[PDB]
Amino acid sequence: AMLSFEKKYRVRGGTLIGGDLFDFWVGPFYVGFFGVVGFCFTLLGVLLIVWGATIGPTGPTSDLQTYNLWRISIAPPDLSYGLRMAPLTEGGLWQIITICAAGAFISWALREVEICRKLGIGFHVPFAFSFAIGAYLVLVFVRPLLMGAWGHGFPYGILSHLDWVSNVGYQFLHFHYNPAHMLAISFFFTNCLALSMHGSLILSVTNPQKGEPVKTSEHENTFFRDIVGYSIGALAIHRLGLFLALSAAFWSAVCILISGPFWTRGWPEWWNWWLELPLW
Amino acid sequence: MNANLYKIWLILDPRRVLVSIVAFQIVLGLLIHMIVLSTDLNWLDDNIPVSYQALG
Amino acid sequence: MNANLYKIWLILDPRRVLVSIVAFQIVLGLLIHMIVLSTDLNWLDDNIPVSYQALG
Amino acid sequence: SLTGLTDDEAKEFHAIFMQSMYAWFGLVVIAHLLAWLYRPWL
Amino acid sequence: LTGLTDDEAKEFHAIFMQSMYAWFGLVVIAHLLAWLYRPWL
Amino acid sequence: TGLTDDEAKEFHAIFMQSMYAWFGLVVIAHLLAWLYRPWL
Amino acid sequence: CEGPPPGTEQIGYRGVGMENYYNKRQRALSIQANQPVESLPAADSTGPKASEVYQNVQVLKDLSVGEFTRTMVAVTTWVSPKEGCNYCHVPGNWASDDIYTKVVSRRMFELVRAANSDWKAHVAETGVTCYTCHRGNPVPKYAWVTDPGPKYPSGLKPTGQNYGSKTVAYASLPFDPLTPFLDQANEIRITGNAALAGSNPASLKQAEWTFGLMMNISDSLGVGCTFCHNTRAFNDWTQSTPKRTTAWYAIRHVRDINQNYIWPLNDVLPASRKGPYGDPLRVSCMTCHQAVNKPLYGAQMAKDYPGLYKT
Amino acid sequence: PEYQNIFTAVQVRAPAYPGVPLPKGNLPRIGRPIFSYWLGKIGDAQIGPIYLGLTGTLSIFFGLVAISIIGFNMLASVHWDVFQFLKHFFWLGLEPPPPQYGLRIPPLSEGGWWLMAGLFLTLSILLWWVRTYKRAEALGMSQHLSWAFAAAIFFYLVLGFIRPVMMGSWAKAVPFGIFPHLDWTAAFSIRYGNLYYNPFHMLSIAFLYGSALLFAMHGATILSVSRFGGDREIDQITHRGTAAERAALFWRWTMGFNVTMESIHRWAWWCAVLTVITAGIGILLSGTVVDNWYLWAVKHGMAPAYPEVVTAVNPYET
Amino acid sequence: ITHYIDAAQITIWAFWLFFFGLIIYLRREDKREGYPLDSDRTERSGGRVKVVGFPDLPDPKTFVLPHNGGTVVAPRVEAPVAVNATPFSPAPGSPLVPNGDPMLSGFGPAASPDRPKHCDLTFEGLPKIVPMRVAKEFSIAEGDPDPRGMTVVGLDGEVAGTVSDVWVDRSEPQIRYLEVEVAANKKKVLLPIGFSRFDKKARKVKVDAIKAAHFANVPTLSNPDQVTLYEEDKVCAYYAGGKLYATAERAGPLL
C-alpha cells in the first residue's frame, strides 16, 4: 500500500548501484541494491546473535547459557589475538557480527542516498546518519586498531555492554573529567532542551487555546523574545538542532578515541596543564 | 606502456587527479612516518648517536 | 624539470595554493617543535649548558 | 572528449605529468637509498 | 582555467620557484646549524 | 586586491623595511638573552 | 597529549572491559628511575654475635660482626650517603644514643623487620629495605602530613574538598583521605548488601571520602580502578582481583606503621619534620610505591640482608 | 554541488519587530532591539526586545541572589584570591550542609549558604515556570512549553529537595560547582550500587539518545526540504505541501512508516520529556526503596554472568 | 519480611503500561495525513476495504485559520489525482516512468500537491512573501552583496538571466526567492533561495538544479506582486525535478 499522495513520487532511477535490477519497493520499503545487500548483512548478523545466545559463553549445556534478554552477551576476543581473526567460539563470532553490522549500517545510509535522489531532496539525513556510523566505527575499528587488538571493542549484550562502559571509564579513575566527554554531554543536554522547546512551540501555535485561530510566525518569534529576549528563527532552530545532535556524536567519538590511544593516565590529571600554567 | 595512454586525460579530469594525488601523498607520508616511529626503527628516541638528557 | 611546468598555474589557483602553504608550514613548524620537545632531543629542559634552577 | 581537453592538450598534460611524476619518484628513491644506507630495515 | 594568462602563469612560476628555493635554503641552513649542535642520527 | 602596481611597490617598500626593523629588535633581544642565560 | 599505541594488558574476562593502558615511553623511563642499588657482597657469617661484641645493640643482636658491619654500610647508602656513618652516630662513640637520628633508626629497623616477617600478606617475599622509602635521602621524598587546604576567612568553615589537589589525582574530591583512612581507621565500606533499603545508613558524602582515598591509592600505584575492582560491583570480592586482597592488608599495614612506629617518635623528631598541625611526616602508599604497582618494579633487595627480618 | 542552507549568505534587514500586541494587564516590553550580523549568519539577527513583569523580575532577583551566594562562597574558599579563583574555578564549590544538621537550617559558617542558594534558586526556577506559562497565555498559545518545563523541574526538585527530605538530610543534596557536581554524580552511582542497573536510568538514557536521534533526523529532514519551504511548519501543517510529502516518503521508504509534520513534534516532545520524567523517578527510588541497584538486578534476574577469570579472598571472611 | 515484588519493579511495569498507551496515541496522530492508504486491495474490493493498519484513524481535528481564512480538517477525504506516468513493469511495487518531457511531467521529484490558491499572510494580514519592490522598508544587510543585477547561471555554467528583484519574508525577514529576468523570453520567474549558491566575488548565482534553457519553463505567477501557496509548490517542485531529470547522468546508476 501507498500513502494517498505517494504514487506520484514513485519514480524509476536515481540509483547509485543496481539500476532496474533491484529498483522496486516491498510494501512501504524501497529496496534497491543496498536494500538487498543490507538485508543480507542484517539477517545474517541477527541470526548469528541468536546462535551466540544459543551456545552461550561456554556451550549450550553450561549454566552460563541463557535466553534471558538482559543477560545474553556475545563478546569480543581476548586482547591476545591482536588484529587477527579469533576462532568463532572465542570471539570470532563477535568479529563477524561486527563486519555485518558495519555493512548493514553503511548499506542503510547509501539506500538513504538513493531515496534522496528519487525525491530530489537534500542529503542532510544520510550525512547526519554518517556521524552515528562514524562513532560506532571509532568504537569497533579506529580505537581498537590504534591500541592493537580487536578485543578492545564492546560486547553485544544489553547489560553486558554497560559493564564494558563502566570498566573502560574507571580505567581513567574519574572519566567525568574527560574534556571531550564534558563537551559532548553539554551537547546532548542542550540538544534535549532545544528539542523540547521546539516540539512545544510548534504544538502550541498549531493547537492554540480554545477559540483561537492557528498562530503565526510572528507569534513564534514574539514568544521566545518575551521569555529570553531572542528568537533564533523557524529555519535556524532546525539548523541548531542538527548542529547540537551531530556535535554530540562527534565529540563522543573524539572522547573515546583519545581514551587509550592519546591518553593513559587519570582524566582529572589531564587538567594539570591548566593548574601548572605559570600564571598562578 | 601503450602509445595512446595520453587519452586518459580525455576521460579523467586532470585537475581532479592532481589534487587527489597530492592529498593522498601528504596523508600517506604522515601515516608512514608515524607507523615507522611506533616501531624499532624509531630514530628520535633511540639515544643514537648519544642520549642528550644524560648530559645533566 | 620540464620547460612548461609553469602551466600548472593555469590549472591550480595560485593564491589558494599560496595560502595553503603558509598554513601547512606554520602548523608543521609548531607540530615538529612539539614532537622534538617530547623526545630525548629536548633542548629546553636538558640543563645544558647549566641548570639555572640549581643556581637558586 | 569527456574532460573538455583537446587531443593536443591531453598529449601535453601527459608529457608534463609523466616527467613530473618520474622526478617525484626519483626523489623518493634517493630518500630510500639514504635511509637504507643509514638504517637498513630488511 | 584559473583566469591566468600564459604570460602571467609564467611570471608567477618564476617568482614562486625563486621564493620556494630561498625558503628551502633557509631550512638547509637551519638544519645544518641544528646538525652541528645536536646530531640526531 | 585593488592595489595598482605602484601601490604594491610602495607598500612592499614600507613592509620590508618595517619587517626588517622588527627582525633587528628580535636579534638584539636574543643577543641580550644569550649573554644573560645561554640556553644551548 | 600522548601518542599511540599504548601498552595494554587484559585483566578481566573478554568484553568486561577490565583492561590496563600505559604509556610505553614513560614506563621505560620509570623503570630507569626505579633502579635498585646492587646488594653488597656477602659477609662472613661466623664468629661472635653482635649481641656479645657491641655495647648497645638492642635490635640486631644475632648478626655476626661481619653481617652487622655490612648492615651499617648498607643503611648508610640507603638513607644518608652524602653524610655517611655519623648521620646516626655521635662522633667518637658508636654506642651512644645521644642523637635523634639513631633513636629513629632503631625503630626504623623494627619497622622493616616487622614488615618483612609479619606482613607478607602485603609485601610477600619481596619485602622492604630502608631504600624503599628513603631512596638515598634522610627525609623520604613521598612522606605526608595532614593537609590544611586553602585558607578561608574566619567566618566560613573549610570544607576539606572542592579544590584542585594532587593528593586525589586532581579531582575536587575530599583532598585529605590520608588522615582519616591511612592513619586513623575510618570505615571505607558504603555499598549495601541487600537490594532494598532498610539497613544501610552509609551516606553519599562517605562515598566521596572513599572515592578520594581510592583516587589516591590508584595514583600511588600507577593503576586504574580495575587493577583491583570489577566496577559493576566495587564491593563484591568474588568479582575483584587478588590485588584487592593485597591492598586490604596494605591499608592495615600502613595504619600499623603510622600509629605504632611514626607517631610515637614525634617527640624526638625535630620541628622541621612536622606539618602545620604538629603531626610528623609519615607513610602512605606513595611513600614506597612511588607510582609503581610494586616498589622498584618488584626488585628483591631485602632477601640479601638477614638483619632485615625478625629473629 | 548545492546550497545546504546551513549559513545565510545574503542577509536582509527590516525595522525591528516589537512583537505581537499583548492584552491589557501585560506591561510594555523593554529594550531597543539591535541587529547582530554574525547571529544573522546562522539565524535571526534581531536581539530584543524582552518582556519583564512582576513574575520575571522576582525570578531574576531570586536567581541573582542564588548565583552570587555561590560565587561568593567559591571566592571565599580561596581566601579572596581572584587569581586562584580563576586557577581553581572548575574545582570550587558551594557545599551542602554536614550530616549532623539533618534537615535543620544549618549555621551560616557551615551549610547555611548552600541552603539559601537552593531555596532561592528553586523559587527563581518556579517563578520562571510561571513566566513561561504567562507568556504563552498572553499570546493565546497552548501550554506545551510549561508542561515540559515542569517535567524538568520535577527532576531538579528530586535531586536537591524531595530525595534529601525523604532521606532526612540536606547533606544528601547536590553541591553547586563544576567538578564537584560531577563528583556527586559518580559518588551517587557508587553509593547506590551502580546506576547502570537502575531501569529508570536505562530508560532516561534511551530517551536522551533518542532526543539526539530525533533532532538529527528531524533537523536534517527539514533542511533537506527547506528548498520546498519545509521550515515553515505552520503552513505545512495546515496546508500539506510537497515538503511534508517528501519528508514522510523519505522515512516511509527508509524504515517502513512515517509521521506527519505536526506529529513529529509530538514524538519529539514526549521523547525529551520522558528523559527527565524517568530520570526523576530513577533518583526518587534510589536510597528510599532500592539501596543497591546491582543487587536489585540480580534479584530480578537481569545481571549477566561471566566465566570467573579473576577473584579475591574476602579478608573480612578470613 | 521478604517479598519478591517491590516498588521499583511495580513502578517499571507501570511505566510500560503508560508507554505502550503513549505509542498508540502517537501512531493515531501519525495517520492524520495520507490515510487510508492507496492499495490494490481497495481497488479490487470496489472500495469496500479501507487500508488503515493499526491503530485506526483518529476522529478529525479542526484548524481554524486566522483572518477568516476558513477551517482545515485532519484527517480528510482527498480526491484521487491522476499520475502523469506509466509503470515500468506491471508487477506490484514497480516504479513508474514520467510521460513526455520529464521536466514538465509533474511526476517524480517534479511532482507536488495543489496547495491553496491564496497567499500565506503576515499576522497583520498582508501577503507574507513579496519582492523588495513592494516592501520598501527592507534593505540588504551591510556587509553582504545586493543580489539585484547578478547574473544567474545554470548547472552547465550558461547564463540563464539576471536577478531583477529579491523576494523577502515580511514576517521573519529573510530572502525566500530571487526574481530572475530570463534572457530567452524576458519573463520574470521565481528562483528559491534553497536552490541558489552565491559566487560573491563574481556576482553570480549558481543553480545546480536545472540548465540555463530550462529557466524558460519555470512556472509563472498569476500576480507579479504576491505568491500563493499553490504557486510556491509548483515553482519549487519544478527546480527539484531537475535534480533527477536535468541531465542523463543524473538517472544513475554509477555502476
Ligand code: BCL
Ligand atoms: C634542536 C632543536 C632546535 C631547532 C631546530 C629547528 C630546525 C632544524 C628548523 C627550525 C625552524 C624554526 N625554529 Mg626551531 N629549533 C630550536 C628551537 C627553537 C625555539 C625555542 C624557543 O627554543 C624557537 C622559538 C624556534 C623557532 C623556529 C622558527 C624561527 C623556525 C620555524 C619557522 C616556521 O615555522 O616557518 C613558517 C613558514 C612560513 C613561510 C611563514 C610565513 C610568514 C607568514 C607571512 C606569517 C603571517 C601570519 C599568519 C598569516 C597568521 C595566520 C592568521 C591567523 C588567523 C591569525 N626554534 C632548537 C635550538 N628549528 C626552521 C627554520 O629555520 O626555517 C627556515 C627550521 O628549518
Ligand code: BCL
Ligand atoms: C564510569 C563510566 C563513565 C563513562 C564512560 C564512558 C565510556 C567508556 C564511553 C562513554 C560514552 C559517552 N558517554 Mg560517558 N561515562 C560516564 C558517565 C556519563 C554521563 C553522566 C550523566 O554521568 C553522560 C551524560 C555520559 C555521556 C556520554 C556520551 C557523550 C557518550 C555516549 C554517546 C555516544 O557515544 O553516541 C554515539 C552513538 C553510537 C555509537 C550509536 C551507534 C548507532 C549505530 C550507527 C546504529 C545502530 C542501529 C541498531 C542496531 C538498529 C536496531 C534496529 C531495531 C532492532 C529495529 N557519560 C561515566 C563517568 N562514557 C561513549 C562514547 O563516547 O562512544 C563514542 C563511550 O565509549
Ligand code: BCL
Ligand atoms: C629513519 C627514517 C627517516 C626518514 C625516511 C623517509 C623516507 C624513506 C622518505 C621520507 C620522505 C620525507 N620525509 Mg622523512 N624520514 C625521517 C625523518 C623526517 C623528519 C623528522 C623530524 O625526523 C621530517 C620532518 C621528515 C620529512 C619528510 C618529507 C621531507 C618527505 C615526505 C613529505 C611528504 O609527505 O611528501 C608529499 C609532498 C608532495 C607529493 C609534494 C610534491 C612535490 C613538492 C613540490 C616538493 C615538496 C618538497 C620535497 C618534499 C623536497 C624534499 C625532498 C628531500 C629529498 C627530502 N622526515 C628519518 C630520519 N622520509 C620522503 C621523500 O623525501 O619523498 C621525496 C621519502 O621517500
Ligand code: BCL
Ligand atoms: C630570558 C627570558 C627573558 C626574555 C627574553 C625574550 C626574547 C628573546 C624576546 C623577548 C621579547 C619580548 N619580551 Mg621577553 N624576556 C624576558 C622577560 C619578559 C617580561 C617579564 C615580566 O619578565 C616581559 C613582559 C617581557 C616582554 C617582552 C616584550 C617586550 C617582547 C615581545 C613583543 C611581542 O610579542 O611583539 C609582537 C607584536 C608585533 C610583532 C607587532 C609589530 C611590532 C610592534 C610595534 C611591537 C611593539 C614594540 C615592542 C613591544 C618594543 C619592545 C622591544 C624591546 C627591544 C624588547 N619579557 C626575560 C628577562 N623576550 C621579544 C622582543 O624583544 O621582540 C623585539 C624577543 O625577541
Ligand SMILES: CC[C@H]1c2cc3[nH]c4c(c3C)C(=O)[C@H](C(=O)OC)c4c3nc(cc4[nH]c(cc(n2)[C@@H]1C)c(C(C)=O)c4C)[C@@H](C)[C@@H]3CCC(=O)OC/C=C(/C)CCC[C@H](C)CCC[C@H](C)CCCC(C)C
Ligand atoms: C526536556 C528536559 C530538558 C529541559 C527542558 C526545559 N528546560 C527549560 C525549559 C524546558 C521545556 C524552559 O521553558 C526553560 C526555558 O526558559 O528555556 C528557554 C528552561 C531552562 N532550562 C535552563 C537550563 C537548563 N536546562 C537543562 C536541562 C533540560 N531542560 C533538559 C535536558 C540544563 C542541564 C542539562 O543541566 C540546564 C543548565 C534555563 C536556560 C531555563 C530556566 C531558566 C530559569 O529558571 O531562570 C531563572 C534562574 C536564574 C538563575 C535567573 C538568573 C538571571 C540571569 C543570571 C540573567 C541576569 C539578568 C540581569 C538583569 C543582567 C544585568 C547585568 C547588567 C550589567 C546589564
Ligand SMILES: CC[C@H]1c2cc3[nH]c4c(c3C)C(=O)[C@H](C(=O)OC)c4c3nc(cc4[nH]c(cc(n2)[C@@H]1C)c(C(C)=O)c4C)[C@@H](C)[C@@H]3CCC(=O)OC/C=C(\C)CCC[C@H](C)CCC[C@H](C)CCCC(C)C
Ligand atoms: C548522530 C546523532 C544521532 C543519531 C542520528 C541518526 N541515526 C540514524 C539516522 C540519523 C540521522 C538515520 O537516518 C537512521 C534511521 O533510519 O533512523 C530511523 C539512524 C538509526 N539510528 C538507529 C539507532 C541508534 N542511533 C543512535 C544514535 C544516534 N543516531 C545519535 C546520538 C543509537 C544510540 C545512541 O545507541 C542507536 C541505538 C536506528 C534506529 C537507525 C539505523 C537503522 C539501521 O541501520 O538498520 C539496519 C540494521 C538493522 C535493521 C539491525 C542490524 C543488526 C546487526 C546486523 C546485528 C546487530 C549488531 C549490533 C552491533 C549489536 C548491538 C547489541 C547491543 C549494543 C545491545
Ligand SMILES: CCCCCCCCCCCCCCCC(=O)OC[C@H](COP(=O)(O)OCCN)OC(=O)CCCCCCCCCCCCCCC
Ligand atoms: C511510572 C508510572 C508511569 C510514569 C509516566 C508519567 C507520565 C506523566 C509525566 C509527564 C507529564 C506530561 C504532562 C503533559 C501531558 C500532556 O500534555 O497531554 C496532552 C496533550 C494533548 O494536547 P494537544 O496538543 O492535543 O492540545 C492542547 C490543547 N489543550 O498530549 C496528549 O494528549 C498525549 C496523550 C497522553 C498519553 C496517553 C497515555 C495513555 C496510557 C494508557 C495506558 C493504558 C494501560 C491500561 C492498563 C490497565
Ligand SMILES: COC(C)(C)C/C=C/C(C)=C/C=C/C(C)=C/C=C/C(C)=C/C=C\C=C(C)\C=C\C=C(C)\C=C\C=C(C)\C=C\CC(C)(C)OC
Ligand atoms: C564572586 O562571584 C560573583 C559575585 C562575582 C558572581 C559569580 C558567580 C559565579 C561564578 C557562580 C558560579 C556558579 C556555578 C559554577 C554553579 C554550578 C552549579 C551546578 C553545576 C549545579 C548543579 C546542580 C545543583 C542542584 C541540582 C541543586 C539543587 C538544590 C535544590 C533543589 C534545593 C532546594 C532547597 C530548598 C527548596 C530549601 C528550602 C528551605 C526550607 C524550606 C527547607 O527551609 C527550612
Ligand SMILES: [Ca+2]
Ligand atoms: Ca636518533
Ligand SMILES: [Ca+2]
Ligand atoms: Ca638547553
Ligand SMILES: [Fe+3]
Ligand atoms: Fe520542526
Ligand SMILES: [Mg+2]
Ligand atoms: Mg564533593
